[PDB]
Amino acid sequence: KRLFIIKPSGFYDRRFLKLMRFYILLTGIPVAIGITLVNVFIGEAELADIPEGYVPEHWEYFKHPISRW
Amino acid sequence: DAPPLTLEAIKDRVLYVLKLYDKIDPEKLSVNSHFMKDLGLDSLDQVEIIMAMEDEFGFEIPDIDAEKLMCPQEIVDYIADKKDVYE
Amino acid sequence: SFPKYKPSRLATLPATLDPAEYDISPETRKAQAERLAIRSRLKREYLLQYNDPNRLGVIEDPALIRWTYARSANIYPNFRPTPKTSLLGALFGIGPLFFWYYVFKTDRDKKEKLIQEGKLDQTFNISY
Amino acid sequence: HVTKDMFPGPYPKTPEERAAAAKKYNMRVEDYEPYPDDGMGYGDYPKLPDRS
Amino acid sequence: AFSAPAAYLTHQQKVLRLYKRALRHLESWCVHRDKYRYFACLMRARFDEHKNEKDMVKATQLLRQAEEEFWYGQHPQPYIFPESPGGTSYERYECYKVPEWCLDDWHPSEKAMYPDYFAKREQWKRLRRESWEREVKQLQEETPPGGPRTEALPPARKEGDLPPLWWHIVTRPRERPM
Amino acid sequence: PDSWDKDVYPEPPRRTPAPAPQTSLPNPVTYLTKIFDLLVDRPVTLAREFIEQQHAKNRYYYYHREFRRVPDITECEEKDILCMFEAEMQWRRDYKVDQEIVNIIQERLKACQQREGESYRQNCAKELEQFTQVSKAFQDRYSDLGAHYSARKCLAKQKQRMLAERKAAKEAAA
Amino acid sequence: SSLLDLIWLETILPKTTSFIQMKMSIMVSNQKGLIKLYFLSFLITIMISMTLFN
Amino acid sequence: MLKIIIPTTMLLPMTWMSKHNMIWINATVHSLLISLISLSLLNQLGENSLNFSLTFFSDSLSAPLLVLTTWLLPLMLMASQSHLSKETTTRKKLYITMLILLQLFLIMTFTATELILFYILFEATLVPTLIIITRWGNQTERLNAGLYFLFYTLAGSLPLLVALVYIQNTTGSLNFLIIHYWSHPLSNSWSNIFMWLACIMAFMVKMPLYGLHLWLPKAHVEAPIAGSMVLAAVLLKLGGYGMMRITTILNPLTNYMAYPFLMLSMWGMIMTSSICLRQTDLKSLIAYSSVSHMALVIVAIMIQTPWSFMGATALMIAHGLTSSMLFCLANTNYERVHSRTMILARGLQTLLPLMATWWLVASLTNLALPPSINLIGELFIITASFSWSNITIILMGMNMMITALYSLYMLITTQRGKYTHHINNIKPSFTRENALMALHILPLLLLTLNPKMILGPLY
Amino acid sequence: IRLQEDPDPEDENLYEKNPDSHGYDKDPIVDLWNMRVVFFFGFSIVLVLGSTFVAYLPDYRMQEWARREAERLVKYREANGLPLMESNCFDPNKIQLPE
Numbered sequence A: 001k002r003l004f005i006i007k008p009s010g011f012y013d014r015r016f017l018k019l020m021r022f023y024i025l026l027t028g029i030p031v032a033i034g035i036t037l038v039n040v041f042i043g044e045a046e047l048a049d050i051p052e053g054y055v056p057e058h059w060e061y062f063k064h065p066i067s068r069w
Numbered sequence B: 001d002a003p004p005l006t007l008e009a010i011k012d013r014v015l016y017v018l019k020l021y022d023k024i025d026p027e028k029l030s031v032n033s034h035f036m037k038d039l040g041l042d043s044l045d046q047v048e049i050i051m052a053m054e055d056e057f058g059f060e061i062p063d064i065d066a067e068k069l070m071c072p073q074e075i076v077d078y079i080a081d082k083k084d085v086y087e
Numbered sequence C: 001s002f003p004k005y006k007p008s009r010l011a012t013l014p015a016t017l018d019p020a021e022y023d024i025s026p027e028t029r030k031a032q033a034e035r036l037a038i039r040s041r042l043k044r045e046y047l048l049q050y051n052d053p054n055r056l057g058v059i060e061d062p063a064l065i066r067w068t069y070a071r072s073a074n075i076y077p078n079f080r081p082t083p084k085t086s087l088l089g090a091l092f093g094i095g096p097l098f099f100w101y102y103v104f105k106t107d108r109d110k111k112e113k114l115i116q117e118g119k120l121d122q123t124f125n126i127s128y
Numbered sequence D: 001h002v003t004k005d006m007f008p009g010p011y012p013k014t015p016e017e018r019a020a021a022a023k024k025y026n027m028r029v030e031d032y033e034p035y036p037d038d039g040m041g042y043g044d045y046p047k048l049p050d051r052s
Numbered sequence E: 001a002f003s004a005p006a007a008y009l010t011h012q013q014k015v016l017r018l019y020k021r022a023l024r025h026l027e028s029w030c031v032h033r034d035k036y037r038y039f040a041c042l043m044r045a046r047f048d049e050h051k052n053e054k055d056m057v058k059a060t061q062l063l064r065q066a067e068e069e070f071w072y073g074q075h076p077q078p079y080i081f082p083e084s085p086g087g088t089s090y091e092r093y094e095c096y097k098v099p100e101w102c103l104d105d106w107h108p109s110e111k112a113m114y115p116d117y118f119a120k121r122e123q124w125k126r127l128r129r130e131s132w133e134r135e136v137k138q139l140q141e142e143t144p145p146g147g148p149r150t151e152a153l154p155p156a157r158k159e160g161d162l163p164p165l166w167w168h169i170v171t172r173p174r175e176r177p178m
Numbered sequence F: 001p002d003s004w005d006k007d008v009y010p011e012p013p014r015r016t017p018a019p020a021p022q023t024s025l026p027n028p029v030t031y032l033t034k035i036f037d038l039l040v041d042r043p044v045t046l047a048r049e050f051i052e053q054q055h056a057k058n059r060y061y062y063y064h065r066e067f068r069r070v071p072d073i074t075e076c077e078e079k080d081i082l083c084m085f086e087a088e089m090q091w092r093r094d095y096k097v098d099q100e101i102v103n104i105i106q107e108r109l110k111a112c113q114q115r116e117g118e119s120y121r122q123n124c125a126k127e128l129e130q131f132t133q134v135s136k137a138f139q140d141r142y143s144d145l146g147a148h149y150s151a152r153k154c155l156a157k158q159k160q161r162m163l164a165e166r167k168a169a170k171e172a173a174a
Numbered sequence G: 001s002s003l004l005d006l007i008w009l010e011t012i013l014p015k016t017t018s019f020i021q022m023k024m025s026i027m028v029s030n031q032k033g034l035i036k037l038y039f040l041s042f043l044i045t046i047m048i049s050m051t052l053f054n
Numbered sequence H: 001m002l003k004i005i006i007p008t009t010m011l012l013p014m015t016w017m018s019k020h021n022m023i024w025i026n027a028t029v030h031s032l033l034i035s036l037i038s039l040s041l042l043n044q045l046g047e048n049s050l051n052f053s054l055t056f057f058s059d060s061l062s063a064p065l066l067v068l069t070t071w072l073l074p075l076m077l078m079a080s081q082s083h084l085s086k087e088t089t090t091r092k093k094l095y096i097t098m099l100i101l102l103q104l105f106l107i108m109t110f111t112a113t114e115l116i117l118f119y120i121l122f123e124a125t126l127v128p129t130l131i132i133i134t135r136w137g138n139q140t141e142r143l144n145a146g147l148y149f150l151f152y153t154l155a156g157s158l159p160l161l162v163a164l165v166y167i168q169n170t171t172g173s174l175n176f177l178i179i180h181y182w183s184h185p186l187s188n189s190w191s192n193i194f195m196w197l198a199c200i201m202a203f204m205v206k207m208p209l210y211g212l213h214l215w216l217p218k219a220h221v222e223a224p225i226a227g228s229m230v231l232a233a234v235l236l237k238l239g240g241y242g243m244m245r246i247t248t249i250l251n252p253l254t255n256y257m258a259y260p261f262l263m264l265s266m267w268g269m270i271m272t273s274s275i276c277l278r279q280t281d282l283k284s285l286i287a288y289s290s291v292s293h294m295a296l297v298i299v300a301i302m303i304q305t306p307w308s309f310m311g312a313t314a315l316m317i318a319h320g321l322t323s324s325m326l327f328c329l330a331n332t333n334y335e336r337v338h339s340r341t342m343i344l345a346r347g348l349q350t351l352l353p354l355m356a357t358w359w360l361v362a363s364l365t366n367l368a369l370p371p372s373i374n375l376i377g378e379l380f381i382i383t384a385s386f387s388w389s390n391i392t393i394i395l396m397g398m399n400m401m402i403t404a405l406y407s408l409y410m411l412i413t414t415q416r417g418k419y420t421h422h423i424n425n426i427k428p429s430f431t432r433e434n435a436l437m438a439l440h441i442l443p444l445l446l447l448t449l450n451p452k453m454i455l456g457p458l459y
Numbered sequence I: 001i002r003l004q005e006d007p008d009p010e011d012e013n014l015y016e017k018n019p020d021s022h023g024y025d026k027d028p029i030v031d032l033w034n035m036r037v038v039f040f041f042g043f044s045i046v047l048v049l050g051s052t053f054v055a056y057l058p059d060y061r062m063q064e065w066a067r068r069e070a071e072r073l074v075k076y077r078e079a080n081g082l083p084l085m086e087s088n089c090f091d092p093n094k095i096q097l098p099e
């Protein structure tokens, strides 16, 4: 024999958790993919001496491509 | 975990204990015989019977409720009601 | 005979050892009946409101409301400045302040004296 | 639903006030006993036994 | 717990409760069964010795002396059944007890997951709603004008009626809900 | 490695003893190391080689900003707000640089202690002395300036220290 | 909670100041509107201004 | 700063021209957009502050507070839309307008570059708050609470105005950069003592200091949910920000005038934690917890070391977020049962599981559980106080023990136990409430991940 | 009684008319769209984008620059026997003490 288990409504909590996970992963996954692609293909800059007579920009003074952007 | 109790099992166990009691003749013992009126016991004997049932079933019957259990059928009904036994 | 049990504030007297439980006057029985009647009336009201099928909400407890009001809002209007209240307030609201001020002032005076005398181990004490 | 006369009040001074306070707290007159009037702000709240 | 208390305990009730408590603590002291049986028979012999007493004042004095002796000689760590108030398994399942009013707030999908149970639940709710007026009328008919002097409740005096104030007693959560 | 300066971050030459087994039993550590090389090291090496090959196609550079020296609070006139601002900014940058110097020395000390291990008390005396000197100088320079520290306050503290030193020297020579 | 927070910290700043303001307000506004009274007050004020202030 | 100020002044016409059923949606969406825009101020410099113009500037201390305000506005909107369903459209728009005005004044306060403008704006923050409290509070005590709050703050602040105008007359400028670069030592005299008293007492009343705090329980308990959220998260931080800004010119007199305030703050922190141990009201418990945390911040500011300022800033941000979350949880439970008694509703762990999880996380962050920014700030303050003296460790340890005790006492009383039998109107938690709790808690953990963003200029 | 006052209305439940209600509004469509805009904008936009923006904020605090400058100064000073940390922030030649 199986007896009915009286429990409070968990549908609303499950729905909230599902919606929150979806909306975090709605932009989270594309951001992670973009970050991975940028790191793999457009790597970080290599430190080098400033060529004489050349005035770089601040984004050329920063290293990571996303920080430079 | 443990097998569920049944009305028949509760009745059999309480009758078992009462027949192992030495102040009750098992032949003139039935599920409707009263401890005082038609069995000839007294208050101390009833207290001992309630303690024996507590030992048998592993749970305590409060003193306010134990004083009113004057019949094996009453004990069966009380134990089944407390343990949620319906079949 | 057996050693007596001395009740305390945080270990009260058991009911079975209370001498008042073995000296029962007929007035005491009437008082007990009145107390039971009061409890029964309150229980009946609560059970009616609790088993009402159409009720949807919280059963208000006037006793709880009185307790929360007396603990919070009814303290000041019943406060009178007496010698006991004045002494207790002065002590508990001033004494700790001056005690800690004295302690910290003495500690810092000793520290400054050591610093000026230049015999305090301040090496590696970079973060402050 | 609580009325204004069913709230804790000042220290009861007369047997009429003590009877009214005892009735208010759903307590017997003989069992009702307020905290002493030390000016500590207890009011007519009963001093129930210090048990847990 | 199922019986409404009286205004006081009679002398017989006091002495019976003392007898049971003393036997329990003696069993705590006498761990072994034969030793417990021996000393419990001696205890019942003492109670039988004092069983017949014409002087109720002397009986009360003997009860007081026995209570003092018990308090001196009680086991500091007596045996308590696991489900009993002092037991190790007391109130373990109180967090698993969920009520039917919580049940009726479910989503329609959750309700549809169990079609047959909720039909019987609706039958129970109809039974509850069709009897409340009779229950309250019966309660107010039998009570004295002054008010209830005890917590006892009456049965159903009629064939088509239910005992008043029954819903939560009948629908209380099971002892092992989950 | 060429990522960091070996002179800025010193490291003694490692001396790994040659294995000299004395039993015919196999070496489980050797077998597990071989398995680790065959299952983890080679795949991660291939992945990193591909990643570096991708990096080399789009190589670009970033530079280290250079700041020229400006007159400090000693040269600044009284209530000359522009020079005071320039000197304060330069002092703050130098303060940050000194903090990083202390951090470098502390990292060297920690690494040497961990490396020497059981004989760190004797073998790390050289790094403890450098840290002692650096910490003493840093504390003397920026010990108790306060939450609202400034180049003026540090200059006043240095003036007080110099006056105390001059008084002590004059008393000694007297 | 009771003695300090709810009684004495209330008595020192907010209650004593409010009581003083209430008492002074009652004292100032407790005037019967008698021109004889406040014109005699005017005379006293005029004499005080003439003598005290130099 | 106009790229953040003007969008709020455009939020006002949006609120007053939106349709009756779209006011909350529009306000929430555009408040979130303004918060995203204001996230740009976190890119601070390592040498000097961000001087946008002659009127507004941003610093490593001003940026996190501005971001907190801009992030807190939509949460207040959600709670208000929860508890203001039956109000008329005009009154809903008025409430949203009050919230918008409060946010605008707070932004201009944190970005003001001059002391007198800062004073004007941080005094202007009283009017919307007073209107909100005394108009949309539920109980009869909202009027008395508003009176207490207003008069405490103003009695503190008027001598501050006199001191500011006197400082302007004496020195020539109240610009913060000028008073920092041209600061001169404050000689030990009665006049300087009373100037110090005026400034510090104004900000201590705003903090609030122990012995000057009654208005805080009065206002926080009796204000609506949005008012309670803004009172604890941001309005309490005006005192700390002002004290950090004003103590530039008060040295070296602060080394000697800080003893009474330090003793008051420490002992009152202990006393308010003990009060939290024996509170019969949940909102009062949270208010006194706020008092204890701000007393700790006062201690840090008064001891005035670079390690204390960082801890003070971190504790301010963490306490703001935690207090907002706790007030929201208490408001949800109040909306369930229409009463603030803590022991009235129990068993909420078995009645509402995810809300119990939110309660647990909020209580864990309330006590200093590492590596949370609450713990980071508290530990920095404790270490700075230990450097100051070696019995401050005794006081801080007692405070931490009582803090854990009362936090877990609140959690156990509200959640654990068995549910009240007669309370049968506790509906399942709403998606809006759960989203509000998530938006309260996730930024706290992200700031734990990146701690240097809230450690102030001294980092 | 002393007034013509409305009785206190019973509390209204949003789940009664709309079983799948997010608690934002009475109208189901407006409620759903309020939930959608709140979740999308707040969580996705603010949380994810602002958090990654803060993570990838450029090093304007000059932590890396300060580390590189310290490395260069340590290299230069230790390569020439000079102390790693100077004993004076300013020049005593440029400081004129009173007599």
Ligand SMILES: CCCCCCCCCCCCCCCCCC(=O)OC[C@H](COP(=O)([O-])OCC(O)COP(=O)([O-])OC[C@@H](COC(=O)CCCCCCCCCCCCCCCCC)OC(=O)CCCCCCCCCCCCCCCCC)OC(=O)CCCCCCCCCCCCCCCCC
Residues within 6 Å of the ligand: A020, A021, A024, A025, A027, A028, A029, A031, A032, A035, A036, A037, A039, A040, A043, A044, A064, F038, F039, F040, F043, F044, F047, F051, H442, I047, I048, I051, I052, I055
């Ligand atoms: C569900 C709800 C959840 C809610 C959560 C709460 C709320 C969240 C709100 C939103 C939060 C937003 C956060 C924004 C973050 C922004 C991104 C960021 O900052 O990234 C940081 C950082 C990014 O670095 P970067 O500065 O951009 O560039 C790095 C380099 O310069 C350049 O690197 P590179 O050039 O070397 O190339 C690296 C490249 C490539 O690297 C590799 O390829 C490496 C691996 C190679 C393996 C190859 C193996 C071989 C395979 C083939 C084998 C074939 C042969 C087989 C042979 C078999 C044998 C024969 O990889 C990457 O670039 C990694 C990108 C990682 C992106 C992370 C995004 C996080 C989420 C953002 C959105 C938030 C929502 C959630 C979304 C979730 C999405 C899933 O990434 C990481 O840190 C990644 C993790 C690090 C390693 C793992 C952790 C190790 C920890 C060890 C110590 C602890 C141990 C003890 C544990 C505790 C005690 C028990």
Ligand SMILES: CCCCCCCCCCCCCCCCCC(=O)OC[C@H](COP(=O)([O-])OCC[N+](C)(C)C)OC(=O)CCCCCCCCCCCCCCCCC
Residues within 6 Å of the ligand: A037, A038, A041, A042, A059, A060, A065, A066, A068, A069, F058, F060
């Ligand atoms: C499998 C997929 C990948 C297939 C790859 C196939 C092989 C490719 C081999 C070649 C790869 C490289 C080719 C191009 C080389 C030059 C790259 C380049 O331009 O580098 C520029 C720079 C390099 O740095 P730089 O300092 O040289 O800058 C030069 C800039 N240019 C050339 C453009 C003038 O790299 C970046 O800027 C990194 C990429 C951008 C990072 C930021 C992205 C933000 C995206 C939007 C965020 C969200 C907005 C919306 C929010 C709301 C949403 C609802």
Ligand SMILES: CCCCCCCCCCCCCCCCCC(=O)OC[C@H](COP(=O)([O-])OCC[N+](C)(C)C)OC(=O)CCCCCCCCCCCCCCCCC
Residues within 6 Å of the ligand: A026, I036, I037, I040, I045
């Ligand atoms: C080199 C390229 C790198 C990458 C570049 C990427 C650029 C992207 C450019 C396009 C962006 C705009 C279009 C997409 C907008 C998002 C829609 C979406 O995902 O919906 C799915 C989700 C889920 O959709 P759903 O759940 O309704 O539908 C599921 C499917 N059916 C129909 C079967 C149920 O939409 C929502 O949840 C709707 C919420 C409200 C959305 C309101 C959008 C308003 C307009 C956009 C404003 C953006 C402002 C951002 C902040 C400012 C800038 C930082």
Ligand SMILES: CCCCCCCCCCCCCCCCC[C@@H](O)O[C@H](CO[C@H](O)CCCCCCCCCCCCCCC)COP(=O)(O)OCC[N+](C)(C)C
Residues within 6 Å of the ligand: A064, A067, H039, H064, H067, H068, H071, H317, H443, H446, H447, H449, H450, I046, I047, I050, I051, I052, I054, I055, I056
């Ligand atoms: C259901 C199960 C739950 C658990 C499992 C969830 C899924 C797995 C998640 C596991 C995460 C464990 C922690 C590991 C985190 C890895 C990423 C982290 O390490 O990155 C941090 C990234 O830190 C971010 O900065 C934190 C974002 C902080 C966002 C603050 C709030 C955002 C705005 C919200 C508004 C509210 C304002 C509140 C007041 C300000 C470190 O910073 P950093 O090393 O340097 O980044 C390197 C990139 N660089 C080199 C270019 C710099």
Ligand SMILES: CCCCCCCC/C=C/CCCCCCCC(=O)OC[C@H](COP(=O)(O)OCCN)OC(=O)CCCCCCC/C=C/CCCCCCCC
Residues within 6 Å of the ligand: H007, H025, H029, H033, H034, H037, I029, I030, I033, I037
């Ligand atoms: C500081 C700012 C920085 C720059 C910001 C740039 C982004 C600008 C942000 C624009 C705000 C986005 C819109 C806000 C949400 C609108 C809410 C909404 O859609 O209303 C609900 C809406 C209408 O109201 P009802 O629910 O029907 O009520 C009926 C009552 N009887 O519901 C519906 O039925 C509509 C269903 C289909 C519409 C789908 C819309 C999807 C959203 C995308 C549209 C926007 C276009 C994209 C433009 C991008 C511009 C960069």
Ligand SMILES: *P(=O)(O)OCC(C)(C)[C@H](O)C(=O)NCCC(=O)NCCSC(=O)CCCCCCCCCCCCC
Residues within 6 Å of the ligand: B042, B043, B044, E011, E012, E013, E015, E016, E022, E025, E026, E029, E046, E047, E050, E051, E052, E053, E059, E060, E062, E063, E066, E067, E069, E070, E073, E074, E075
């Ligand atoms: P039933 O209704 O027949 O019960 C008969 C009763 C007992 C009710 C009688 O009708 C009755 O009332 N008789 C007169 C009252 C009386 O019996 N008084 C004396 C009884 S108490 C007594 O004698 C106890 C003495 C011995 C037991 C003392 C317990 C102390 C030992 C405990 C030690 C703790 C660990 C072992």
